[PDB]
Symmetry: C3
């Protein structure tokens, strides 16, 4: 499944530099790579909506005198290659599943800079839940190539849209539900999806809230963004899922040739952190964990105002990256109550001596563990409290840099803080 | 609105010393000032209930040999002046609005020493809510001069009393409701007041509990108490709302002439702290903030037993005051959800690495953010959770002493502790 | 009530060594004492189920060459003595009440090593509540001698069993209910027992959950286990309820002659801690308090796997014990809301200065303190929140070792952790 990753990375980077050098467009500027990279993406996917010759905005000029200017560029070489490469048997069909991950990676930056909440706004649920709407805005043909990488509310938004629009309805609805029930591990959650499948949406707010307790299964992959791809000189053992990516970004960072763009120099750490969020998909991650992993503090998006408009970005510094530990991408749900037992959570004193009094429950509702028939909302709450009661998240381990020696994450005072908090 | 504050302070202090010196009553003892001050107050307000000659309890004697004794005193000079000064056009009507603030200030000490809960007891709600019953016991004609300074449960107690007693009912009820809806900023809170206005009191417990989340708008003013007023030699630029009051109390404290009374010397810090609670109305304030502001620890009322009876107080030390930061009096509600967005409050891991698991919600009820019609109690809870979710309280800033350089309050380990906790 | 404790301890130890020395069974090995001690117990209680000659498993051998082997032993001397001693008027009837406490003490080790949840499993309630099922498995005739030492769910399991099986039903049910209502101090709790008494068990989950807030009254006694009894040379002033027990265990520990058994040497601290849990009945205690009391960290049961089988235990170290503070055994419920007043729990700012915002309530439900009729579940919750609101637990004090100087427990970072947590 990753045998072709090396050669597909190579093919992307090549088409990028071919098209950039033909029009004298320097690829040591990350903004140029972002625009060139998205044009190549569009030739592989929506072959018919882009124009054979069109004008785009690049940083043109010599040796740090670059200015943004509209360059007319011709894609019919890249277009002809792209329409073949979709079905080329040499890639063993691994092309579209790879393009979808590449689009998730390369669209991450804009979802950070231009924080909106299209999916929870359309579903009419709390915008705290947009963290589970990832992969929104990917071309649909790519979405069918990576349904496990698409957040559960994207699938849920697809289901409700279906009910507000043919005999193919029985087959489309079946597969959307199928993607939903693989992601949503809760017994009460699958029951709620069943209700949604029959158009009964009363459970929506409760289902949506349950996703922060009984967390869904979201597949992650570590995919380089277009500026990294163009400036990577060796894809020899490329993976999307182990220390290679970490080592690849350190190698480019050490080259100190790729420059990054932004509104002004106060953004230079943030831009660089945005590379980590795109490649490793840590946009939703705990910032305390991230600081430990990469060895530096991460900004929250609050710490800056609105991004400037893409035409008014400027070079503001150099790409930089380093890391202290690494980890593989999570594929299973982060929390499991399998073989979990809430044990003693209260004191039964035997000494008369006074001492502080604890209650490890918010109310006696949180301890109602049910035999006598129970109501559905209580079923939900009880199942959620079981996952809430877990004190650890994740599945295996972090590794020290330069090997696979397992190092337990020690903790942080910056834990339980978040990029959009 | 404060142009007359200097001259009204002057007039109070003058009438006080005039009446004290006529009967050889020393004003360097705070208890004497408290009794003399309340007699002058009563001449300006309930002109007909006090007696022209009557006996009161003062600390009489020479040079630290004072003993408490009943002195008969004659008020008909102070009484004649008082009946004029109510309507004297030279004060521009600012007299009663000032007398009401002075009575709030000078009644604060007794509400601390003799902690009872008349308003929540009469409303039959938790006595934790007496913090919102301030200004109770003020003469009603003064209450109409400062309805924004009167706690919302005083207005609420007035409304329920009205329904348990004429065509003026439509006008009295209207104005009480009007004061209530200006103080209670919650949309669900105004709906609950509407229900109360129509005699439906089922929401009482919920309305009362909501006041600790969606906090009401309470107007504060910094007004000197009678012992400070008599011992202040300069009212030149007097305000009730900026650093002048702070500087005025430091000036008297530095004189080291005013002595304070109490049951025994173990009360001497507490008595002095009671001056801060009366003048700056910090009775409800966070003791950790207070310690930072004034630079010393504040006692909780638990740390002492019952006050002795007023006849058995003795001189126990000197008035003392100092401060490190200052702030203006709050007039708006302390919490606002305007332009507030609860953002990301949960982690979506992308690394397999295990890490601690957080849940920033007590139950999945606390995340039910609602389109589908919602029940009223949930409306309340959801609105309350929005205010509960705020992490900061207050509106502007503290200033360092001796200027208006804004200094962010850094925090304290003594925060979230309270005078009646 | 304790006048006979010295002589009853003496009689137990004597019968133990008599039967052990007759068959050359060394009593300096704790496993031998445990088996011999339980045989003597069985002769005093279920006189007819044990066999006059039978084979048991002991550590036989010389001077650290002991191996486990089946020894046939003859009890008809110990049996003849035992059938008399039950009713011997010289013990003043104090025999059975003492045997029941001795059985609670000596069965504690197995309930730790072989953690099961028979009572909550049979009641079908959360196994977090097995902490309130103590004294289960005691011979019933002993249970009637110490009903206050039997956890409330044992009595509750007895009541439900009664309803699933005669004119004596009115008298048995009455006394079980009577034991239940003395243990369960909550007004809503007694109401729930009343419902159970009439076979209405809907309240079960709520009653069971309420026991962690409104904690029941459980009687404790400090009783030596069989290995301590055999190796105690002086019962002169023996009590079950003051510093004597502490001093008695230190004396044997200092002898360094009793060896303890377990699966391997990594258990040697845990085994020794199990002596403290049996004698002082701290199985349910706060481990942070325990560490302070005895001056060493206590293991949680998680820190080890399953015990080996009793035939495969080996000597792994020496008995050891020490202590820094002591306390009497608790007899009353650990929490009381009598004369408790929740006071100010919220801030009413008077300064405009911003500051952190606290809410000392999980939801506005937790503040609903009710006049207007309230529903029963809310009655429960409100009563429970009153006990939840208490910040201190226990009734009197701890004492420093070697006297009765009261020392307030200072706290611990290891508090709110538990043996079965």
């Amino acid at each position: 499944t990753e045998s072709q990753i090396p050669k597909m990375y190579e093919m992307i980077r090549d088409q990028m530099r071919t098209l950039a050098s033909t029009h004298k467009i320097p690829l040591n500027i990350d903004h140029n790579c972002e625009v060139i990279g998205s044009i190549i993406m569009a030739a592989c996917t929506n072959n018919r909506d882009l124009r054979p010759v069109d004008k785009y905005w690049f940083l043109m000029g010599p040796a740090g005198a670059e200015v943004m200017t509209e360059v007319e560029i011709d894609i019919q070489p890249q277009l002809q290659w792209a329409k073949g490469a979709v079905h080329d048997p040499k890639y063993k069909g691994q092309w579209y599943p790879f393009l979808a991950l590449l689009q998730i990676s390369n669209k991450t930056k804009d979802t950070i800079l231009w924080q909106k909440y299209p999916v929870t706004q359309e579903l009419e649920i709390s915008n705290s839940l947009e963290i589970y709407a990832n992969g929104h805005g990917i071309k649909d043909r790519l979405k069918n190539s990576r349904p496990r990488s698409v957040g559960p509310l994207v699938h849920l938004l697809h289901l409700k849209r279906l009910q507000e629009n043919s005999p193919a309805v029985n087959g489309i609805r079946k597969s959307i539900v199928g993607h939903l029930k693989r992601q949503c591990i809760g017994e009460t959650q699958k029951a709620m999806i069943n209700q949604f499948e029959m158009g009964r949406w009363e459970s929506l707010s409760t289902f949506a809230a349950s996703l922060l307790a009984i967390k869904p299964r979201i597949e992650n992959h570590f995919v380089l963004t277009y500026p990294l791809i163009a400036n990577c000189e060796d894809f020899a053992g490329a993976t999307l899922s182990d220390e290679w990516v970490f080592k690849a970004m350190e190698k480019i960072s050490n080259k100190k040739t790729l420059r990054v763009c932004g509104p002004d120099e106060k953004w230079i750490s943030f831009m660089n952190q945005i590379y980590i969020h795109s490649v490793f998909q840590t946009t939703g991650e705990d910032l305390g964990v991230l600081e430990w992993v990469f060895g530096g503090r991460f900004c929250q998006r609050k710490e800056f105002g609105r991004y400037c408009k893409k035409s008014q970005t400027k070079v503001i510094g150099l790409f930089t990256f380093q890391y202290e530990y690494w980890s593989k991408p999570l594929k299973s749900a982060p929390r499991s109550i399998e073989g979990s037992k809430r044990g003693q959570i209260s004191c039964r004193p035997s000494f008369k001596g006074k001492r502080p009094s604890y209650n490890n429950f918010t109310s006696i509702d949180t301890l109602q563990s049910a035999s006598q028939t129970v109501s559905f909302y209580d079923q939900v709450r009880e199942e959620c409290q079981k996952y809430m009661d877990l004190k650890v998240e994740g599945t295996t381990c972090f590794y020290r840099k330069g090997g696979h020696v397992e190092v337990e994450f020690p903790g942080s005072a910056h834990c339980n803080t978040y990029l959009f908090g």
